[PDB]
Design a binder for this molecule. Structure first.
Ligand SMILES: NC(=O)C1=CN([C@@H]2O[C@H](COP(=O)(O)OP(=O)(O)OC[C@H]3O[C@@H](n4cnc5c(N)ncnc54)[C@H](OP(=O)(O)O)[C@@H]3O)[C@@H](O)[C@H]2O)C=CC1
Length: 343
């Protein structure tokens, strides 16, 4: 606790779902934290209402797509920042402007923050963790091949051009190219910068919000999947959603281990606990919250098993490297849905 509080951690996109959980666990370990936010309203909310700690401060970085967006942060604080967790990237399916709104901010946000480290903190930052995604390991078009296999070594095969069929496949591409850019940065700057890099690459991230916001009927994208199911009417049509799941608090823990442990240097950490279709989620919600039974859809129990749909995922290497057991779906669903209901 004494050694940790000598260390300042910079976290991009501090107001987001995953980043708040990261910052929560950083403050639990007595680290000092600087987070970037896009507005004073968001920054004040974090410092005044959520963390309430002298170990948390914020800075405004309005748009990560911008040339030199992170230069003022590292000019001011570069001498004190030993760890950088770059988590900020647009996750939104509501745009048709795939390059302007997804691909370019993802890539230039990642290139930009690393260039700013080189410019103002080349010998000060020891460790960087980039939040990548399962999307960087597979395109949407290769996610549902039961005869394939995804591992830490798998890369999304899409091109800048062909991922632009729709906002989901384009967002998947944005993660791929941004992660590629982070490793390429070290490829060309091995002798210019001290920091070592690792990436945390999650599947769909569920779990409780770090802080309930009274008037938010729309959560972040991954969390809004469960929010929708809880509020569907019994006869409503079912969304189509299928992937791996992982709990947000396991994601936060993995980000912190990824800068503390030396065996995680240079690793792509594939964070994944189990497979789901919407039926998997409906079965779990109905089972664990019987007060929703007959109020939300039941789907067709016994149908649409994710094993018969999705490409298998082998992340046994990541599990051994991290050395902790991931929360299972029943835990995730209990913690997530109970918080929604309590609000
Ligand atoms: N949730 C999931 O299932 C997964 C998430 N990820 C990655 O995790 C990270 C966080 O996503 P998550 O927490 O899930 O979703 P959130 O939407 O909660 O967090 C997104 C964050 O990115 C910030 N942001 C987006 N675009 C910009 C921009 N152009 N300039 C500055 N800040 C920006 C948002 O700022 P504001 O708060 O102002 O919008 C927000 O803080 C992202 O890199 C995402 O790709 C990876 C795999 C799965």
């Amino acid at each position: 606790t004494a050694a940790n509080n000598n260390t300042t951690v910079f976290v991009s996109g501090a107001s987001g779902f995953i980043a708040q959980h990261i910052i929560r666990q950083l403050l639990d370990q007595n680290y000092k934290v600087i987070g970037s936010v896009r507005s004073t309203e968001k920054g004040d909310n974090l410092k005044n209402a959520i963390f309430k700690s002298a170990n948390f401060n914020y800075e405004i970085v309005k748009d990560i797509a911008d040339l030199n967006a992170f230069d003022p942060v590292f000019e001011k604080h570069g001498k004190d920042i030993k760890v950088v967790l770059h988590t900020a990237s647009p996750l939104n399916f509501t745009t048709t402007e795939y390059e302007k709104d997804l691909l370019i901010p993802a890539v230039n946000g990642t290139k930009g923050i690393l260039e700013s480290i080189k410019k103002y903190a080349a010998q000060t930052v020891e460790r960087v963790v980039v939040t990548s995604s399962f999307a960087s390991h597979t395109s949407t078009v290769d996610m549902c091949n039961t005869k394939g296999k995804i591992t830490e070594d798998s890369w999304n095969q899409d091109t800048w051009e062909n991922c632009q069929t729709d906002a989901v496949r384009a967002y998947f591409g944005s993660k791929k190219f941004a992660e590629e850019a982070a490793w390429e940065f070290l490829n060309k700057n091995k002798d210019t910068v001290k920091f070592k890099l690792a990436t945390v690459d999650p599947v769909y991230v569920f779990g409780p919000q770090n802080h309930i916001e009274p008037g938010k009927k729309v959560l972040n994208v991954s969390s809004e999947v469960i929010n929708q199911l809880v509020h569907l009417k019994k006869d409503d049509p079912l969304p189509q959603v299928a992937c791996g799941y992982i709990d947000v608090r396991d994601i936060a823990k993995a980000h912190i281990l990824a800068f503390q442990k030396d065996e995680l240097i240079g690793q792509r950490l594939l964070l994944h606990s189990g497979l789901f279709t919407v039926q998997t989620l409906l079965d779990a919600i109905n089972e664990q919250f019987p007060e929703l039974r007959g109020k939300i859809p039941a789907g067709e129990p016994g149908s649409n098993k994710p094993e018969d749909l999705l490409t298998p995922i082998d992340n046994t290497k990541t599990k051994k490297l991290l050395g902790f057991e991931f929360r299972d779906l029943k835990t995730i669903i209990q913690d997530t849905v109970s918080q929604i209901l309590e609000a």
